[PDB]
């Protein structure tokens, strides 16, 4: 090596070195050890470059332009040696990155300047191995450029883009090569439309060709399922690195083809990660893309339209940015309200359900930006949101919240007697409005809330429940995975200035082109509190606890108990009556002629977060006890509803005693 360094330092013999490297000469040798007894053939240039690789790479990077020019001038008949030398130079430039900066970028630009010399490499009717070599070289160039000098226009973009598109469109490539291409996707994501929609077309063609309509056609353990999940995870990683609105559109279209996706957790985690990371403009662009997907008149079924909001848009909205939420709200104020106040059709069944779904989705969206936004914008003096059609910053108050709460109240107060076209969809529509109204109410005003019920044959309780589904409450809460993230790239994929061995493992992957995954200590890897909780309810298998409007209303009840109502510290706070909401719930629960599901709903409401229920005691002791001791209940035997009711009502002893009054003593004896 020292003699080679001296020989190179003597003059400028770069041409001789490329020439002696790109030289066909076979050096016959005997069998290495004992293999066959015949001779072993190997090239002179390959051996010479294999031994003293570093010196040749260093002096070729010294005279970069001439070396690249000669190498790509002789790259028609020596494709093995040219690829080997180019890869060696790229690895050499990737090493010493923190000190020898701008050498790798210069090498990548110089290589990209002569793509027409490698045009005959990736073309049609070419060997597949040569195409994989072209893909690997292109990947190395893209990572070593770090998306600094390569972009649309002024970068010889058409040749590279045509190469990438032709690599994608080839039908002979296996799924792993297309997966490497999908890994290379984020470098081409700065599209400008027009002719660059061909990327979208070939991506959709790939999705149609290799992805099944249902995600259950491949049984677990089959190689087809593993390849499918690998391709999906590569697509999701490309989305995360990309933040492309097109990629989000494609993956949501794929995800919403079925109610349950085998890799739904990965989809939601990727959506929440791209919602957390980024800038304001990217977030509003992504939200606008999903919103325009949702509000488009296409022959798409109702559950797919519901899944566009419930699974995708909900996560992005909940993990969005504060100002992006405000801008999205200001964008979507006008259309949502006129949609909510719009009249119905009730003529064609295909038009009924889409209108119902659109109203339900708009209610959920407004629920989200009322739950996550402060009161200083929805209703205040300097409100950036201008709901009024006239606008011009005139008047003051709230012409938005009043109309929204009025529309929600009208949605609750719906008389469905004699109207039987679709019931469950509206059941959701009524529950959706209630939760939207609760989220609006929670952060606008204080004191006593809106009047409840009012009768006139329009009560929220009958509209929010099914009245026909018998809840199968078992003896106890019991008897109501997939593919996981798999291994990780720990101590690899990045130097991170933390470990040199990790840096060598990260260069092994760059050189070989295949990422390395070790074995993780624990199969589940919770990075943070993502999906664990939002910004005590450890029982999800119950139907009454997994109700659309049970979780919101209980949160509303807990909000009533804290920082609202009479000040704390009351001793024997009115043990002769109840407040309007409490006494309303008492009347609906204490009455024995109301359907069973309402009584079960209110009883489970009382059981959950029993702190608020315990004050005003010796009052709620009886309506729970009548339900506990009754022939009509959640089921036969001592089911867990009875167990919870009995535990709560016996833990209330001392403060309240079911004695003295003969009405409850008989029922207590019956219960015993």
């Amino acid at each position: 090596s020292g003699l080679l360094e001296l020989a190179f330092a003597f003059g400028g013999l770069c041409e001789r070195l490329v020439s002696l490297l790109l030289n066909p000469a076979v050096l016959s040798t005997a069998s290495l050890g004992s293999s066959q007894g015949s001779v072993i053939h190997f090239s002179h240039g390959e051996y010479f470059y294999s031994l003293f690789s570093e010196t040749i790479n260093t002096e070729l990077l010294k005279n970069l332009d001439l070396a690249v020019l000669e190498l790509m001038q002789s790259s028609v008949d020596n494709t093995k040696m040219v690829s080997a030398v180019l890869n060696g130079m790229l690895d050499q430039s990737f090493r010493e990155r923190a000190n020898q900066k701008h050498q790798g970028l210069k090498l990548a630009t110089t290589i990209l300047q002569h793509w027409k010399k490698c045009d005959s490499w990736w073309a049609k009717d070419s060997p597949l191995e040569t195409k994989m070599a072209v893909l690997a070289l292109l990947a190395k160039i893209l990572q070593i450029d770090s998306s600094v000098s390569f972009n649309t226009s002024h970068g010889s973009f058409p040749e590279v883009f045509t190469t990438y598109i032709s690599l994608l469109a080839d039908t002979k490539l296996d799924l792993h090569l297309k997966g490497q291409a999908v890994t290379l996707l984020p470098f081409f994501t700065s599209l400008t439309g027009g002719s660059l929609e061909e990327l979208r077309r070939v991506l959709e063609q790939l999705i149609v060709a290799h992805f099944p309509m249902q995600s259950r056609e491949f049984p677990p353990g089959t190689p087809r399922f593993n390849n499918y999940v690998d391709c999906m995870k590569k697509f999701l990683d490309a989305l995360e690195l990309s933040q492309s609105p097109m990629l989000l559109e494609l993956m949501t279209e794929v995800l919403c083809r079925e109610q349950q996706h085998v890799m739904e957790e990965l989809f939601q985690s990727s959506f929440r990660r791209i919602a957390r990371r980024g800038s304001c403009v990217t977030q509003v662009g992504l939200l606008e893309s999903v919103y325009e997907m949702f509000r488009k008149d296409d022959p798409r079924l109702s559950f797919t339209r519901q899944s566009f909001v419930d699974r995708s848009l909900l996560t992005l909205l909940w993990h969005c940015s504060l100002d992006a939420l405000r801008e999205f709200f200001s964008t979507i104020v006008v259309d949502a309200i006129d949609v909510l106040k719009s009249r119905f059709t009730k003529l064609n069944e295909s038009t009924f359900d889409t209108q119902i779904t659109k109203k339900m989705g708009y209610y959920k969206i407004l629920d989200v930006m009322y739950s996550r936004l402060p009161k200083d914008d929805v209703h205040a003096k300097e409100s950036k949101i201008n709901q009024v059609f006239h606008g011009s910053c005139i008047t003051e108050g709230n012409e938005l919240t009043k109309t929204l709460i009025k529309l929600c109240y009208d949605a609750f107060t719906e008389n469905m007697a004699g109207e039987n076209q679709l019931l469950e969809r509206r059941r959701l529509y009524h529950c959706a409005a209630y939760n939207c109204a609760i989220s609006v109410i929670c952060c606008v005003f204080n004191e006593l809330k809106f009047y409840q019920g009012f009768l006139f044959s329009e009560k929220p309780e009958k509209n929010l429940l099914i009245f026909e589904n018998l809840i199968d409450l078992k003896r106890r809460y019991n008897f109501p995975n997939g593919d996981s993230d798999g291994p990780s790239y720990m101590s690899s994929l990045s130097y991170l200035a933390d470990s040199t061995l990790s840096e060598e493992m990260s260069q092994f992957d760059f050189s070989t082109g295949v990422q390395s995954y070790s074995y993780s200590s624990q199969d589940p890897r919770p990075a943070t509190g993502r999906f664990r909780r939002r910004e005590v309810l450890e029982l999800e298998m119950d139907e009454l606890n997994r109700h659309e409007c049970m979780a919101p209303l209980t949160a509303l009840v807990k909000h009533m108990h804290r920082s609202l109502g009479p000040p704390q510290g009351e001793e024997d706070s009115v043990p002769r009556d109840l407040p309007s909401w409490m006494k309303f719930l008492h009347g609906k629960l204490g009455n024995p002629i109301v359907p069973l599901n309402i009584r079960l709903f209110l009883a489970k409401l009382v059981i959950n977060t029993e702190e608020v229920f315990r004050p005003y005691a010796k009052h709620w002791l009886s309506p729970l006890l009548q339900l506990a001791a009754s022939e009509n209940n959640g089921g036969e035997g001592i089911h867990y509803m009875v167990v919870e009711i009995v535990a709560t009502i016996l833990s209330w002893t001392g403060l309240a005693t079911p004695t003295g009054v003969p009405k409850d003593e008989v029922l207590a004896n019956r219960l015993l």
Binding site: S31, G33, I40, L175, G221, N226, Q522
Partner: protein, 605 residues
């Protein structure tokens, strides 16, 4: 926990005292409950050496089981509990490997005395399974060497005289015991062997009878098991036997024959066991009917049973190995068989809707049938290599991990890609990184195997290293990179804590939300055996040389020890040079001018 010895001694004394006063002894009671209780206590014992006292108390004087069953000789229709005693003994004998030999002779004497005057059934089968489990205790012939086999053979052959109404459940175990008389010690069973084999073959022929007569399916399974046991030790090679072994393979061949009635298997399992253990003994018997044999073994490999699955896999492996051996020996005239086998393998491999077991057998066939493929045509091995490498990249070098073994099959695939790499004139330059990643991941996944699978893994690594080093100087550099990367990955694992690891197996971890997998974290000491085996490769060298037929009979190719040692020292020096071991002080800071005194500098040291 500690009082079990006193309790078991008290129970033994009570059992000894039970056979007094009234000879009824509570009829079926008052002994059965005691036997069941002592058996439950014995099987519910502890792990440490406390069991030595109770094992010595079990095999002891009058307050013992052996003296009890010896004195139970006059139990005419009395004390129907000796079978439970024998079952407990065989369970206990299975539970603990007999520590000392003077107890084994007493055990076999007691079971032989049980054999005498054994009325009807329900005790003969316990006695025979006790004897069967006893004969597997030594496995080295250093104990049980007084050689009473002559009297046992004479008695068993005397039992063959009746042959009228012996129970089927008894006859099968009797013939299994007759088969078990072999593989005990040499210079025995060499004079009566011919008569015994003639009687066994005639009895089996009468068992099938080749008619609509009663087949006696339990008897046939025991006959095949005894046949396999006899063929295990004695050669009986058909190469010198043209007539009496063609029928002994035909018997197996009709035993393999599937049917709708499962009949609790046994009879289609003993035949596959015999084939698997004795395929080398039917040369050309397998060849003359390869298509049917292959399809039937594949059909048995595609089933739902577990033991039958293992038997089918082993039988198919032995068949394929024999066929591969004969074709590699005579690849010139043997071309249609190779064409059929490799066409089936090609179809299975290219079938993208394949399973793991079918892919495994296809890859094994790829590995076995390489040399004949090379001699027929040079361009086939390249396609085999590229397809195998693509499949290995698809299945192993992936992040998916839905959940499976996915690591208990890598050595079986590495040994198969090693053969195709050995039989390649030129190597595609683009799959070398894939091969390097495969070998590095195989090295990393070492502490996830049983010891035998660990030895298989090191043998696979040795074979791949030989294939890599027998190709060219550049592939030696690939070997060097593989070794260096493996050393880096081993060194990057977390450091063993200097503090004591407390009591081993103290609990079952936190057991969170579905905490399974049992992925034990490796340490530096978990990889010690692998590199010792790498630097001591002579035994694996001769094992591979005996297994495969290749030009490797020379000490030059054997010198993988020097190569691997040099790579180890070079990697150690490289890691030492590249590592950054400088150290500084971080509790203090620079740019101090008139600030708080603790914030300027620590007291001088």
């Amino acid at each position: 926990m500690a009082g079990s010895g006193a309790g078991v001694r008290c129970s033994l004394l009570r059992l000894q005292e039970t056979l007094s006063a009234a000879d009824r002894c509570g009829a079926a009671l008052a002994g059965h409950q005691l036997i069941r209780g002592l058996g439950q206590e014995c099987v519910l014992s502890s792990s440490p050496a406390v069991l030595a006292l109770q094992t010595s108390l079990v095999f002891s004087r009058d307050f013992g089981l052996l003296v009890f069953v010896r004195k139970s000789l006059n139990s005419i229709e009395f004390r129907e509990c000796r079978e439970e005693i024998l079952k407990f003994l065989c369970i206990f004998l299975e539970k603990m490997g007999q520590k000392i030999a003077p107890y084994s002779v007493e055990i076999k004497n007691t079971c032989t005395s049980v054999y005498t005057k054994d009325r009807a059934a329900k005790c003969k089968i316990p006695a025979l399974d006790l004897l069967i489990k006893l004969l597997q205790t030594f496995r080295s012939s250093r104990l049980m060497d007084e050689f009473k086999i002559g009297e046992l053979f004479s008695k068993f052959y005397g039992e063959l005289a009746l042959k009228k109404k012996i129970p089927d459940t008894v006859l099968e175990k009797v013939y299994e015991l007759l088969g078990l008389l072999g593989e005990v010690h040499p210079s025995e069973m060499i004079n009566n062997a011919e008569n015994l084999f003639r009687a066994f073959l005639g009895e089996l022929k009468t068992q099938m009878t080749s008619a609509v007569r009663e087949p006696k399916l339990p008897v046939l399974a025991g006959c095949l098991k005894g046949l396999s046991s006899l063929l295990c030790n004695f050669t009986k090679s058909m190469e010198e036997d043209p007539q009496t072994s063609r029928e002994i393979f035909n018997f197996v061949l009709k035993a393999i024959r599937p049917q709708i009635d499962l009949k609790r298997y046994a009879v289609p399992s003993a035949g596959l066991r015999l084939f698997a253990l004795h395929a080398s003994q039917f040369s050309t018997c397998l060849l003359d009917n390869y298509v049917s044999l292959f399809e039937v073994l594949l059909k048995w490999c595609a089933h739902t049973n577990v033991e039958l699955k293992k038997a089918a896999l082993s039988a198919l492996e032995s068949f394929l190995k024999q066929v591969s051996n004969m074709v590699a020996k005579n690849a010139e005239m043997h071309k249609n068989k190779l064409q059929y086998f490799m066409e089936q393998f090609y179809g299975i491999i290219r079938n993208v809707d394949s399973n793991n077991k079918e892919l495994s057998i296809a890859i094994r066939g790829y590995g076995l049938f390489a040399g004949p493929c090379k001699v027929i045509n040079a361009k086939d091995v390249d396609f085999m290599y590229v397809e195998l490498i693509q499949r290995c990249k698809q299945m192993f070098l992936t992040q998916t991990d839905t959940g499976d073994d996915r690591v208990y099959q890598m050595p079986s695939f590495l040994q198969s890609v090693a053969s195709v790499l050995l039989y390649l004139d030129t190597v595609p330059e683009v799959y070398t990184p894939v091969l390097e990643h495969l070998v590095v991941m195989q090295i990393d996944s070492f502490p996830q195997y049983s010891p035998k699978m660990q030895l298989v893994c090191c043998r696979a690594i040795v074979k791949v290293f030989l294939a890599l080093a027998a190709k060219g100087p550049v592939l030696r550099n690939c070997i060097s990179t593989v070794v260096h990367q493996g050393l880096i990955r081993i060194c990057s694992k977390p450091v063993v804590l200097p503090k004591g690891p407390e009591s081993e197996s103290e609990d079952h971890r936190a057991s969170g939300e579905v905490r399974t997998g049992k992925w034990k974290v490796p340490t530096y000491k978990d990889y010690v055996d692998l590199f010792r085996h790498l630097l001591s490769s002579d035994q694996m060298m001769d094992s591979i040389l005996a297994d495969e037929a290749f030009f490797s009979v020379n000490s030059s190719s054997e010198s993988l020890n020097h190569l691997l040692y040099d790579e180890f020292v070079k990697s150690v020096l490289k890691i030492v040079e590249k590592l950054d071991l400088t150290l500084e002080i971080q509790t203090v800071g620079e740019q101090e001018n008139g600030d708080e005194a603790p914030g300027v500098w620590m007291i001088p040291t």
